[PDB]
Amino acid sequence: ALWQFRSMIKCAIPGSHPLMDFNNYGCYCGLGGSGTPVDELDRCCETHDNCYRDAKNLDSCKFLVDNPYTESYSYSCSNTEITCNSKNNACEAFICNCDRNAAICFSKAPYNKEHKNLDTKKYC
Ligand SMILES: Oc1ccc2c(c1O)CN1C=CC3=C(CC4=C(C3)OCO4)C1=C2
Ligand SMILES: [Ca+2]
Ligand SMILES: [Cl-]
Ligand SMILES: [Cl-]
């Protein structure tokens, strides 16, 4: 679920304000997205958007209001490491893995402050 994604980011990058840092970064971090991502961080976000797109195409999974962000799973954080619980159902596990891979990806990409609040109408 969305709140758990924020909380995953905060596990992978303890020094971070997820909503301040990663919402409205680049072309893809943010509601929707367009064009080509502007750096590796933005591309982490594009991968996350497409991971969600894939989950909605799982004939087996029908998320509340069609948004996988509404779906809560079980995970834990230990020493910077995210573990998705294996007892998550297949749809929960898929979302869990989109969020974990994105948090891990965010933690390894350089953070370019110029791309925060990018003029997307123009650069994306
Ligand atoms: O990184 C993010 C990835 C995407 C999103 C967010 C992120 O910060 C934050 N965020 C906050 C509210 C809503 C969406 C998406 C959506 C809503 C509402 O209703 C329609 O679909 C949303 C997506
Ligand atoms: Ca997005
Ligand atoms: Cl565009
Ligand atoms: Cl759930």
Curated annotation (Swiss-Prot):
Q: What class of enzyme is it?
A: hydrolase
Per the entry, which co-factors are needed? Ca(2+)
Instruction: Please list the GO biological process terms of this entry.
Output: cellular response to insulin stimulus; fatty acid biosynthetic process; intracellular signal transduction; leukotriene biosynthetic process; lipid catabolic process; neutrophil chemotaxis; neutrophil mediated immunity; phosphatidylcholine metabolic process
How does its activity get regulated? Regulated by bile acid salts. Up-regulated by cholate and down-regulated by taurochenodeoxycholate.
Q: Which UniProt key words apply to this protein? A: Autocatalytic cleavage, Calcium, Disulfide bond, Hydrolase, Lipid metabolism, Lipoprotein, Metal-binding, Palmitate, Phospholipid metabolism, Pyrrolidone carboxylic acid, Secreted, Signal, Zymogen
Instruction: Explain the post-translational modification.
Output: Acylation causes dimerization. Activated by trypsin cleavage in the duodenum. Can also be activated by thrombin or autocatalytically.
Q: Do the record's keywords include Lipoprotein? A: yes
Places the protein is found: Secreted
Q: Name one GO cellular component term.
A: cell surface
GO molecular function: any one?
A: phospholipid binding
Lipid anchor positions (N6-palmitoyl lysine): K56
Residues that, per the record, bind Ca(2+) = Y28, G30, G32, D49
Active site annotation, chain numbering: H48, D99
What is the reaction catalyzed?
A: a 1,2-diacyl-sn-glycero-3-phosphocholine + H2O = a 1-acyl-sn-glycero-3-phosphocholine + a fatty acid + H(+); 1,2-ditetradecanoyl-sn-glycero-3-phosphocholine + H2O = 2-tetradecanoyl-sn-glycero-3-phosphocholine + tetradecanoate + H(+); 1,2-dihexadecanoyl-sn-glycero-3-phosphocholine + H2O = 1-hexadecanoyl-sn-glycero-3-phosphocholine + hexadecanoate + H(+); 1-hexadecanoyl-2-(9Z-octadecenoyl)-sn-glycero-3-phosphocholine + H2O = 1-hexadecanoyl-sn-glycero-3-phosphocholine + (9Z)-octadecenoate + H(+)
Its primary localisation, in coarse terms, equals secreted
Q: How many cofactors are bound and how?
A: Binds 1 Ca(2+) ion per subunit.
- Listed disulfide bonds for this chain? C11-C77, C27-C124, C29-C45, C44-C105, C51-C98, C61-C91, C84-C96
Q: What is its EC number?
A: 3.1.1.4
What is this protein's function per UniProt?
A: Secretory calcium-dependent phospholipase A2 that primarily targets dietary phospholipids in the intestinal tract. Hydrolyzes the ester bond of the fatty acyl group attached at sn-2 position of phospholipids (phospholipase A2 activity) with preference for phosphatidylethanolamines and phosphatidylglycerols over phosphatidylcholines. May play a role in the biosynthesis of N-acyl ethanolamines that regulate energy metabolism and inflammation in the intestinal tract.
Describe its assembly: Monomer or homodimer.
Q: Which family does it belong to?
A: Belongs to the phospholipase A2 family.
**Further remarks about this protein from its record:** Loss of activity upon alkylation of His-48 with p-bromo phenacyl bromide; Ca(2+) and Ba(2+) protect against inactivation.
Return the protein name. Answer: Phospholipase A2, major isoenzyme
Where is the organism placed in the taxonomic lineage, from the top? Eukaryota, Metazoa, Chordata, Craniata, Vertebrata
